[PDB]
Amino acid sequence: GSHMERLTEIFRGVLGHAAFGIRDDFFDLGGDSFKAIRIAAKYGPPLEVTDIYDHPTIEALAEHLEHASSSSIVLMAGDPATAKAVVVCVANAAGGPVNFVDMSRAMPEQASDVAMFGVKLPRTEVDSDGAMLEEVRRLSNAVCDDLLAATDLPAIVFAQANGSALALAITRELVRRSADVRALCIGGALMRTVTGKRDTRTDDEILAFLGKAGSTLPAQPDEQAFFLHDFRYDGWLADVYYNHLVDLMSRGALEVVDIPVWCLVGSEDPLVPNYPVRFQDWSHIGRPVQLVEYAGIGHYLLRDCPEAIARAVGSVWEHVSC
């Protein structure tokens, strides 16, 4: 029915109880990350997960929906009118712009000149690896189109682990169009040099992997279902694109871009513990390659030191300012 009526129905279904009003905070009574994703998915397209964080009440959220407006990116910090550069952020598997919330909230104090856009992951249904590669091309072109229509500022591409895959695509597209790309920043990932295997693991094996990486899996089976759908989809997409790039390398046909690459890694990351020798493999994509090492931190830099990641993005911009 109405905006607030659908919001109240979805909130009562997702939170557990019906004793809920339109002025109560979403987080002060059990709301979170997964529940916000589930809410944004059930409500429909025009609601984004970040709008629940900027508007954790049903009335304010419905007002936002009134003057709301489809884009492939979402503005998270700064304003392109006053800014000197923009940063396009791609999240890890099962993620999205939400992953950068904290980081965005640190940008005004760590990179005041830089605006932040987050890439939305539609997860379009496809029936083949070739269709998946066509979808990677379509999505990278959509992100580039929306970015070049949103701003004409120098652009930095930031990637979170698995998101690196899509990030690479975007960067390369932006070079084909001779757009103003000045840096590729990648967190908690390494360039893939060998053809990869497809993810045939069980849900429990994924839970163990995420425990090893330092993350817990949600308990609600619907939240788990959405998380695992997105996780396996993103893994498939990234595997396809990295295998394409590795084939290009095998034949010597991967062009090196004159764009610097920053590799931000936590020192205690159990997923890339061989980085001291492998981080330099980003030379296949761009040069020079710079390493920033965060001591005592694991894989999830955006969870454990988001302010420092904003600081790294500001540093990258000032390094490529002139």
Author numbering: 2656 to 2724, 2727 to 2979
Sentences from the paper on this structure:
Nonribosomal peptide synthetases (NRPSs) are responsible for the production of important biologically active peptides. The large, multidomain NRPSs operate through an assembly line strategy in which the growing peptide is tethered to carrier domains that deliver the intermediates to neighboring catalytic domains. The paradigm monobactam antibiotic sulfazecin is produced through the activity of a terminal thioesterase domain of SulM, which catalyzes an unusual β-lactam–forming reaction in which the nitrogen of the C-terminal N-sulfo-2,3-diaminopropionate residue attacks its thioester tether to release the monobactam product.
We determined the didomain PCP-TE of SulM, in which the PCP was in the holo state loaded with the pantetheine cofactor. Additionally, the protein construct was derived from the C2818A mutant, which will be unable to initiate catalysis, with a goal of capturing the functional PCP–TE complex. The PCP-TE structure was determined and refined to a resolution of 2.73 Å resolution. The structure contained two independent chains in the asymmetric unit, each containing residues Glu2660 through Cys2979. The two chains superimposed with a rms displacement of 0.4 Å over the full length of both domains, indicating that the orientation of the PCP relative to the thioesterase domain was the same in both chains. As such, the pantetheine is modeled as a free thiol. The pantetheine reaches from the PCP domain into the active site, positioning the sulfhydryl 4 Å from Cβ of the alanine residue that replaced Ser2818. The remainder of the pantetheine tunnel is rather hydrophobic, with Phe2866, Leu2867, Phe2884, Phe2888, Leu2928, and Tyr2957 all bordering the channel through which the pantetheine approaches the active site.
